[PDB]
Design a protein around this ligand. Structure first.
Ligand SMILES: CCCCCCCCCCCCCCCCCC(=O)OC[C@H](COP(=O)([O-])OC[C@H](O)COP(=O)([O-])OC[C@H](COC(=O)CCCCCCCCCCCCCCCCC)OC(=O)CCCCCCCCCCCCCCCCC)OC(=O)CCCCCCCCCCCCCCCCC
Ligand SMILES: CCCCCCCCCCCCCCCCCC(=O)OC[C@H](COP(=O)([O-])OCC[N+](C)(C)C)OC(=O)CCCCCCCCCCCCCCCCC
Ligand SMILES: CCCCCCCCCCCCCCCCCC(=O)OC[C@H](COP(=O)([O-])OCC[N+](C)(C)C)OC(=O)CCCCCCCCCCCCCCCCC
Ligand SMILES: CCCCCCCCCCCCCCCCCC(=O)OC[C@H](COP(=O)(O)OCCN)OC(=O)CCCCCCCCCCCCCCCCC
Ligand SMILES: CCCCCCCCCCCCCCCCCC(=O)OC[C@H](COP(=O)(O)OCCN)OC(=O)CCCCCCCCCCCCCCCCC
Ligand SMILES: *C(=O)CCCCCCCCCCCCC
Lengths: 171, 459, 62, 111, 122, 87, 65, 155, 79, 13, 165, 177
């Protein structure tokens, strides 16, 4: 399974079967046939395999990178510090890529799940998607294929100069 | 990288101490073992490149070119052992030594941590290629083709030497790892304009650029089959590798120095595909197809977006496998009809059905049939050039139409129609030939399953 | 060996694909995402027991 | 959910099985066109069940079963859209293709 | 389809422009005009997932018809009465739209006769 | 489909078509009956006989061959040569 | 037995193909007449198209001045 | 193959023209080269620019797929005038009359689609009416804002 | 083996449109020599083919009879 | 009967 | 469209095989009785193509015409659509006239034979499709728009009148 | 114009080719057999009117304007026979016309599958390679100086000698392999 907080799902509401006609629907008979012929042997083989997993348990871990000094507190042309800062920046860039992927998955899953009323019922997912794409575009767009922490810091300094100038001229 | 350099050098006593009937089998076997061993370079990381020593490293760009290079040597030995069967034993060992030595130069060309070592290995790859073309080429034009191949590359690369030694005197180092952190912006001046030209024109010749491609449909045609395989599969990609290294240093001047070369390549992919529509020589048709495919890689490096680099390295690997297989199919017909004229041997599907299946699959990978990595690289380059300018979709689509046209025209001309009546030495396909075709095609199709190992440093 | 086709071409693939979808695809988020079932006035929710109130009584036209 | 997606993918995998059969052959077949016609008939049968349980409720799903590639923000997955269009076109195309292949066993016989 | 001939081969000053009509106020000519009552609740046709083209003023018969169509499976010829109720109420909505068209056309006739009577008087 | 032609069947069908032609009486006709020398027909008649052969057997005789088939045995031999009968 | 080809004359028919052709033509006309009996509105019309010229001014709100 | 069987430069003397006409296996009176404007044809014959489709299909050609014979001088554009490609055969209608009729038909149809776009047909009805202020929340409207009330009335 | 061809004397064009053709040719002194070759097409089983309204109304009789039977059956079934 | 030999290229290899 | 157009090609291919690879309608004729089952299914497919009432083509094409008439539409596009609807009837009865009706124009060795159960069953299943699939699918698909069912009688009877003309 | 035997077309051959093209295009225009038979007799009368014409200039002029008549009145899609060039089945089976020399490259395990066929093929190959030198010296002694004037081949003259250049005419593939 997965964590229900990061991949949210509203609770399922299926209606009770209320048949009006007298002819038996083929779907319930094919569902019982599926349960007997398919689902129970699959469940038995999976239980056998899960017993074999339970005979010898072992673990893998999530690699924790401690935060190293970033590019702003590294000296100019100091490769031993700015190498660590660049590796930190690239890992943060790849994680932010996967964050945008998670929010796209939420948005598309919402559109399919809500079906025909998706324009009304997926306004929060669309809002979260617009916010995270705005942040990603201010943070990493237009850097080029030779991107680095120096390029991203120069883009941030240019944007902050523009924002400071716009706030200064508005007063 | 020394664990690959040392067995490639040990292929020299392996090819000179072998028994006289064993010199193909031993080199094929142990080069296949080196190609098996090449997969250890896939120890790549999302942040750091696999940095071995002060001399050698391998990021996710050099690694697929290395695996393709170490895979190409047994296939060149399989392709070139039939037409060199009646050769002297010493000249046969010299041919195998030139192939092994070209691989030895290439595997430490792509892994060169420092750029003048890259230049020395990069221009060292001329000499075994020149010896192969001008010695074991078949027709009269191999000497002139060796002249063009030598003197376009050195004319482009001797300004590159002065440019790299200038960077060595200015930055203090030509280590690419140090230049990832000591790169300075290259502003607009005439000095930096000719700096850009000196850093780029050698690789523009090696790709080749349109207008400078005139070494290629003579060097790729007048070579033997192992020469044609290595020239189409690796030696054009040395140029794109050098571009993707050296365009780290050429910013922001590339953002307006790229325009004439982007025009040359966007129009050269139309013109060379149109040239492929009217070729009588099949091998020259594959040569101009290689120019047409490398024009997109030039555009993708010059627009320098991440999607463009991913598509360019995918298209380099895909084109290496596809063009090597197309030259091997052309050789499989040339070893029967003894002519490179495409209209001579016709209707060959009536005679060689499985070889015609290999023709079909190589023509489908040539036209970038999805989900092949041909289409992956083609498609990512089209995405990035559309984001560059929205009007480049006209040229990209017109190129794709002409590419499908000459690919299936090649297929229909050689394989379909009524067979030629006066040709009766069409042997059945040997096991060596079909094995060569499958060892090209089956990795190219398996790479569609897990394509992330050929999408470069910024996948 | 008279109905070996419906065994070897359906009943083994439904087993394989159901095992795959049940223990490797639906174990990952948003792989199999389903449009939620359609709810009408008069329906009873199985997950809640909540009964949907019916529509307003019609201004009858014919 | 479990019946719909399973018979959805079993239809396509059942159609891919005779491609493996024609590729993994040594002998001359015991009537391979009858084998492919029977396979497409049974694929029509397999595709009729998700169509019926779409006609019942309107049940739709996406089967994004295999992550293929992620180009920095574009997660490309093998993704199957089981909507009105797939549910009404797959049995029509399988029924038509079944009739075309039983026509083909007669028309293309001397080939 | 003669109104196309009356708008094109005639004048458009008396014929209504379909993209912008009603041009007249809905109370101009109606003392205490009643509103169109919506029967299907917004959350009811939200939960019924109706198409936004189908969420008109007679969505309640469509909800009843889709409920019968779901409930009478597989007897696909069982709910013709709900379908004809929905079709009849759509027909009545179409008659209402025709009444809007004829109202705008006759008020353009009224404005034309008004300005011609004014040009004759003053 | 497409039952094989025999020389007996081709000769019977060719003489059958030529007996249904009003400028040839059937009691004179044989396989060696030259159309101009024996039967006394025009070259227009020979073109029409070739077109009736084409409409009978369902393939076109080209004019370089149609100008030369001047007896029914030549026609039967040509249809044998272009249908490969008695395999 | 199979069919023997004939010469310049009407070919041999099977009884099965003739009764199948007649049965499916009869099924076509039975279905057309049956659905035209029960529906009769998908061809000719479902609802009576009202006449706007015969509509009064009081139901449309046209005040006389 | 050898030197004096390969193409050469443009023939200027009549004996060079006769030697070239012997070389390309054709008559001296039928041998015309391409005109020496320096384009790079040499002494190669200018054949009458026909497709291979116009060749006699009933003749027993040496290359029946190509309708071409052995030793026959090929056209310069033989790869272009194959039957898989450009056909120059005589057409039942004149070329200019075909071009005029096709261009006039396409232009008339585009002009009439533009006229029908300018004069569209429709039905004598009002606009389709929708509840809840023309479906404000359903069309993605934000609930913090409040739309103008769009009220529809009975008629 | 031996496919026995029918009589060539039995294909006489009297009673066919070939007769009308030869009459309208003999009105100007022309005579047709290939009419008996074409005469099999218009005689025997291929003579008197249906019209187009006869082609569309194939199976109308049995279909309308089945329609009468089914309407009578549902009128007797409601009671 | 009268089965004809079908000339086809060498399918052994 | 899938059912009756696949069946029209299958009936044409039955004619092509029975007339020894003959694909030209000027060398056909008289197949109303020599090929009775192909004739039956070709007439049924032509009627479903032209929009005969309550066959499979009716439940789509009649709704297409009744929705293209009753909409804010390019009028020249609508008029060319109706002229195309007439032309469908014209070429369908061209197929029926030259292929089936009249007198034989094919060569004299009649190898007409449609007696394989592969051919009979393959045409039969698409024939049941061409009779009933429009009705079955139109009653099984849910409503996705609002169908226009009120229109004047010259506008409801447009497709049938133009097809009969 | 273009023939393997002759160097030209005679006037009589041009008239006959015109008459055949005119009847075929008329049959395309006049689909039904009785109506075609009527108009074909009318066309036969139009050719029989100027038939006994002894002025070659007048006959050449009538032939030329009759070609203009035919060009103005040709069917745009005339009926072509299926195996005739242009037809829908023309050169369809050329992909199944494998030449005879491809049997020489078979493996012996599939030559063992047909022992009598290859045992009967070896005497054909033997017969051809003993006929070859005699038919070459037959051609060189009968052909005049300067090469042959026409593409006609001479037949065999002795008994026991095969006709010269017979192999790729006799051992050509069938039309339905
Ligand atoms: C890691 C595990 C991987 C396992 C799965 C492997 C996945 C695929 C791998 C490659 C498959 C193709 C290789 C075989 C064909 C080439 C040789 C040939 O002609 O054989 C014919 C021969 C049978 O024919 P024959 O009649 O006896 O003789 C040939 C005839 O004379 C004349 O021949 P012909 O013309 O009649 O027949 C040729 C026919 C001609 O038909 C065509 O050319 C049509 C194909 C194109 C259109 C249809 C496909 C379009 C794309 C959709 C499919 C991909 C995506 C699907 C997913 C859903 C959508 C996202 O082509 C085929 O039948 C090929 C079928 C497979 C097609 C794959 C795509 C090829 C098209 C070009 C590239 C397209 C993009 C790349 C796709 C890559 C996918 C992995 O086949 C064999 O005997 C098979 C030999 C063994 C093959 C092994 C293949 C895998 C080897 C990998 C080894 C290492 C990994 C271990 C796994 C091993 C698994 C077995
Ligand atoms: C493939 C064949 C053609 C290959 C073309 C290769 C590129 C074309 C341009 C090459 C220019 C020469 C190398 C420049 C290296 C730049 C290094 C550098 O520091 O530059 C800045 C320096 C600047 O001087 P500086 O470095 O001393 O000063 C410090 C910098 N400033 C000025 C800011 C204080 O540039 C130069 O000194 C001159 C550069 C231009 C040199 C022009 C001469 C060559 C002309 C073109 C020849 C092309 C090949 C012709 C033959 C082909 C075969 C027959
Ligand atoms: C007859 C042989 C069948 C198998 C018989 C033997 C097994 C018996 C039955 C049990 C099933 C096997 C065990 C479960 C299966 C494995 C489960 C699992 O987690 O697998 C890991 C994964 C599942 O995906 P994933 O998301 O877990 O991992 C992807 C890997 N990363 C994250 C690194 C990118 O892989 C597979 O299951 C592989 C099967 C792929 C099936 C589709 C192949 C497509 C072929 C064409 C390729 C090109 C398409 C390009 C376009 C795509 C769209 C854009
Ligand atoms: C066909 C063979 C195959 C192809 C081989 C390669 C062909 C292309 C190679 C050269 C590409 C063109 C030169 C570079 C173009 C990029 C922009 C540029 O410099 O434009 C030329 C320049 C435009 O002016 P501007 O750039 O504003 O000048 C300030 C410069 N600091 O213009 C000027 O200032 C005027 C002209 C100056 C001299 C130009 C020629 C010398 C430089 C190029 C060599
Ligand atoms: C919403 C927008 C809608 C727009 C709609 C209209 C847009 C397109 C306009 C027309 C352009 C395409 C048509 C022209 C090219 C047609 C080529 C073709 O079909 O060739 C077929 C030809 C043989 O055909 P045929 O004569 O039928 O053969 C009968 C038997 N001999 O075969 C041959 O002769 C062989 C030819 C081989 C070489 C082909 C060379 C031509 C290639 C043309 C490329 C066009 C690229 C367009 C790029 C557009 C970018 C925006
Ligand atoms: C006015 O006439 C409104 C109807 C739509 C425009 C005219 C459509 C004319 C073609 C359809 C009817 C044809 C009657 C033979």
């Amino acid at each position: 399974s997965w964590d229900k907080d990061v991949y949210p799902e509203p609770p399922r509401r299926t209606p009770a079967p209320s048949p009006q006609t007298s002819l038996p629907n083929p779907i319930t008979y094919l569902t019982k046939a599926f349960d007997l012929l398919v689902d129970r042997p699959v469940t038995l083989v999976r239980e056998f395999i899960e017993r074999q997993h339970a005979k010898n348990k072992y673990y893998y871990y999530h690699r924790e990178f401690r935060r190293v000094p970033d590019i702003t507190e590294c000296h100019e042309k100091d490769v031993l510090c700015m190498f660590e800062a660049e590796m930190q920046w690239k890992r943060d860039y790849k994680v932010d890529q996967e964050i945008v992927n998670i929010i796209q998955e939420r948005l598309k899953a919402c559109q399919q799940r809500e079906g025909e009323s998706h324009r009304q019922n997926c306004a929060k997912e669309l809002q979260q998607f617009t916010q995270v794409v705005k942040a990603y575009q201010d943070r990493y767009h237009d850097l080029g294929a030779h991107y680095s922490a120096r390029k991203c810091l120069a883009k941030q300094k240019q944007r902050m100069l523009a924002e400071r100038k716009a706030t200064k001229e508005a007063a | 990288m020394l664990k690959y350099i040392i067995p490639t050098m040990m292929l020299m006593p392996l090819t000179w101490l072998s028994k006289n009937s064993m010199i193909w089998i031993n080199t094929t076997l142990h080069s296949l073992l080196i190609s098996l061993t090449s997969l250890l370079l896939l120890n790549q990381f999302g942040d750091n490149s696999l940095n071995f020593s002060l001399t050698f490293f391998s990021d996710s760009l050099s690694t697929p070119l290395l695996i393709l290079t170490m895979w190409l040597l047994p296939l060149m030995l399989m392709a070139s052992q039939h037409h060199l069967s009646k050769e002297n034993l010493a000249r046969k060992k010299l041919f195998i030594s030139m192939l092994i030595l070209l691989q030895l130069f290439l595997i430490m060309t792509f892994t060169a941590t420092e750029l003048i070592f890259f230049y020395i290995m990069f221009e060292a790859t001329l000499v075994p290629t020149l010896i192969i073309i001008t010695r074991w080429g078949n027709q009269t034009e191999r000497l002139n083709a060796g002249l063009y191949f030598l003197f376009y590359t050195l004319a482009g690369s001797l300004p590159l030497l002065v440019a790299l030694i200038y960077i060595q005197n200015t930055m203090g180092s030509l280590n690419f790892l140090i230049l990832q952190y000591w790169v300075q912006p290259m502003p607009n001046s005439w000095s930096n304009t000719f700096m850009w030209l000196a850093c780029m024109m050698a690789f523009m010749v090696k790709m080749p650029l349109y207008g400078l491609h005139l070494w290629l449909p003579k060097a790729h045609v007048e070579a033997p089959i192992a020469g044609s395989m290595v020239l189409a599969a690796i030696l054009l990609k040395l140029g794109g590798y050098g571009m993707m290294r050296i365009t780290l240093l050429l910013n922001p001047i590339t953002d307006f120095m790229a325009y004439p070369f982007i025009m040359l390549s966007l129009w050269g992919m139309i013109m060379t595909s149109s040239i492929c529509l009217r070729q009588t020589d099949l091998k020259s048709l594959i040569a101009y197809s290689s120019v047409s495919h490398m024009a997109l890689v030039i555009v993708a490096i010059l627009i320098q977006t991440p999607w463009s680099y991913m598509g360019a390295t995918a298209l380099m690997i895909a084109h290496g496998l596809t063009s090597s297989m197309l030259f091997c199919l052309a050789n499989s017909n040339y070893e029967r009809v003894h002519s490179r004229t495409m209209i001579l041997a016709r209707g060959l599907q009536t005679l060689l059905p499985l070889m015609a299946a290999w023709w079909l699959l190589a023509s489908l990978t040539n036209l970038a049939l999805p989900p092949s990595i041909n289409l992956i690289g083609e498609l990512f380059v089209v995405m990035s050039t559309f984001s560059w300018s929205n009007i480049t979709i006209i040229l990209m689509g017109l190129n794709m139409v002409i590419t499908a046209l000459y690919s299936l025209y090649m297929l229909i001309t050689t394989q379909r129609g009524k067979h030629t009546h006066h040709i009766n030495n069409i042997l059945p396909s040997f096991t060596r030939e079909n094995a060569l075709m499958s060892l090209h095609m089956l990795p190219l199709l398996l790479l569609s399953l897990n394509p992330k190992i050929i999408l470069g440093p910024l996948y | 060996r008279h109905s070996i086709f419906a065994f070897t071409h359906v009943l083994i693939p439904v087993w394989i694909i159901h095992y795959y979808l049940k223990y490797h695809v639906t174990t990952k988020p948003y792989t199999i995402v389903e449009k939620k079932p359609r709810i009408f006035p008069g329906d009873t929710i199985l997950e809640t027991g909540e009964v949907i109130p019916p529509m307003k009584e019609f201004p009858d036209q014919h | 959910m479990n019946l719909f997606s399973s018979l959805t993918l079993v239809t396509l995998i059942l159609l891919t099985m005779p491609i493996a059969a024609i590729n993994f052959n040594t002998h001359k077949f015991t009537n391979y066109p009858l084998y492919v016609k029977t396979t497409i008939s049974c694929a029509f049968i397999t595709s009729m069940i998700p169509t019926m349980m779409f006609i019942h409720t309107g049940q739709e799903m996406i089967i994004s079963n295999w992550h293929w590639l992620t180009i920095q923000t574009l997660k490309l997955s093998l993704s199957f859209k089981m909507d009105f269009f797939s549910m009404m076109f797959v049995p029509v195309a399988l029924f038509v293709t079944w009739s075309i292949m039983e026509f083909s066993m007669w028309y293309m016989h001397s080939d | 389809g003669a109104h196309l001939a009356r708008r094109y081969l005639g004048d458009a000053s008396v014929e209504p422009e379909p993209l912008r009509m009603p041009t007249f106020p809905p109370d101009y000519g109606f003392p205490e005009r009643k509103e169109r009552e919506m029967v299907a609740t917004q959350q009811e046709m939200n939960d019924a997932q109706l198409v936004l083209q189908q969420r008109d003023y007679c969505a309640h018969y469509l909800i009843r018809f889709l409920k019968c169509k779901r409930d009478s499976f597989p007897n696909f010829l069982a709910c013709k009465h709900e379908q004809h109720d929905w079709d009849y109420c759509e027909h009545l909505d179409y008659v209402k739209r025709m009444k809007e068209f004829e109202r705008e056309r006759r008020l353009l006739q009224r404005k034309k006769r008004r300005e011609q009577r004014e040009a004759d008087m003053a | 489909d497409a039952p094989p032609l025999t020389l007996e069947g081709i000769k019977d069908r060719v003489l059958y078509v030529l007996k249904l032609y009003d400028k040839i009486d059937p009691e004179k006709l044989s396989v060696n009956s030259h159309f101009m020398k024996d039967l006394g027909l025009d070259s227009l008649d020979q073109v029409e006989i070739i077109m009736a052969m084409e409409d009978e057997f369902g393939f076109e005789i080209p004019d370089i061959d149609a100008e030369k088939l001047m007896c029914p045995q030549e026609i039967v031999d040509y249809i044998a040569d272009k249908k490969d009968v008695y395999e | 037995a199979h069919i023997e080809p004939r010469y310049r004359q009407f070919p041999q028919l099977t009884r099965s193909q003739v009764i199948q052709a007649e049965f499916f033509s009869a099924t076509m006309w039975f279905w057309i007449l049956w659905r035209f009996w029960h529906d009769s509105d998908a061809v000719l019309g479902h609802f009576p198209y009202p006449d706007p010229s015969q509509w009064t001014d009081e139901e449309l709100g046209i005040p006389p001045d | 193959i050898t030197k004096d069987m390969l193409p050469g430069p443009y023939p200027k003397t009549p004996e060079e023209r006769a030697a070239a006409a012997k070389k390309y296996n054709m008559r001296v009176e039928d041998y015309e080269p391409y005109p020496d404007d320096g384009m790079g044809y040499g002494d190669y014959p200018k054949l009458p620019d026909r497709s291979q489709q116009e060749r006699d299909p009933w003749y027993d050609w040496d290359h029946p797929d190509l309708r071409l014979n052995w030793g026959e001088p090929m056209h310069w554009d033989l790869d272009m005038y194959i039957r898989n490609r450009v056909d120059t055969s005589p057409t039942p209608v004149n070329w200019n009359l075909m071009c005029k009729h096709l261009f006039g038909f396409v232009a008339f149809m585009l002009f009439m689609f533009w006229v029908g776009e300018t004069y569209p047909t429709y039905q004598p009805v009002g606009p389709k009416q929708y509840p809840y202020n023309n479906l404000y929340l359903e069309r993605g409207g934000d609930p913090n804002k409040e739309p103008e009330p769009v009220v529809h009335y009975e008629i | 083996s031996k496919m026995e061809l029918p009589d060539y004397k039995q294909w006489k064009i009297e009673g066919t449109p070939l007769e009308t053709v030869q009459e309208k040719l003999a009105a100007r002194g022309l005579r047709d020599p290939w009419g008996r070759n074409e005469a099999w097409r218009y005689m025997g089983g291929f003579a008197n083919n249906v019209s187009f309204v006869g082609a569309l109304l194939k199976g109308f009789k049995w279909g309308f009879a089945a329609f009468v039977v089914a309407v009578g059956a549902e009128y007797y079934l409601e009671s | 009967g009268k089965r004809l030999f079908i000339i086809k290229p060498s399918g052994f290899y | 469209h899938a059912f009756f157009k696949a069946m029209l090609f299958m009936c044409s291919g039955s004619i092509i095989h029975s007339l020894n690879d003959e694909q030209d309608i000027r060398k056909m004729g008289g197949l109303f009785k020599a090929m009775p089952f192909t004739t039956t299914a070709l007439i049924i497919g032509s009627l479903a193509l032209t929009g005969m009432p309550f066959l499979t083509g009716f439940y789509s094409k009649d709704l297409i015409i009744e929705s293209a008439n009753t909409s804010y539409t390019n009028a020249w596009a609508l008029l060319m659509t109706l002229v195309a609807t007439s032309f469908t009837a014209i070429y369908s009865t061209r197929i029926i006239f030259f292929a089936l009706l009249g007198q034989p124009r094919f060569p004299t060795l009649i190898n007409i034979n449609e007696n394989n159960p592969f051919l009979i069953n393959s045409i039969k299943r698409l024939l049941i499709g061409s009779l009933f699939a429009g009705f079955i699918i139109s009653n099984n698909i849910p409503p996705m728009t609002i169908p226009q069912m009120t229109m004047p009688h010259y506008l409801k009877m447009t497709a049938l009148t133009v097809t009969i003309l | 114009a273009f023939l393997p035997s002759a160097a030209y077309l005679t006037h009589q051959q041009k008239v006959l080719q015109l008459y055949k093209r005119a009847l075929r295009h008329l049959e395309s225009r006049c689909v039904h057999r009785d109506k075609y038979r009527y108009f074909a007799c009318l066309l036969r009368a139009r050719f029989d009117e100027h038939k006994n014409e002894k002025d070659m200039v007048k006959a050449t002029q009538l032939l030329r304007e009759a070609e203009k008549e035919f060009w103005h009145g040709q069917h745009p899609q005339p009926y072509i026979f299926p195996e005739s060039p242009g037809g829908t089945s023309y050169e369809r089976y050329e992909c199944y016309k494998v030449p005879e020399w491809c049997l020489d490259d078979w493996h012996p395990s599939e030559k063992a599958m047909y022992p009598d066929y290859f045992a009967k093929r070896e005497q054909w190959k033997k017969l051809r390679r003993e006929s070859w030198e005699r038919e070459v010296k037959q051609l060189q002694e009968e052909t005049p100086v300067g090469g042959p004037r026409t593409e006609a081949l001479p037949p065999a003259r002795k008994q026991g000698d095969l006709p010269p250049l017979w192999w790729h005419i006799v051992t050509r593939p069938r039309e339905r392999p």
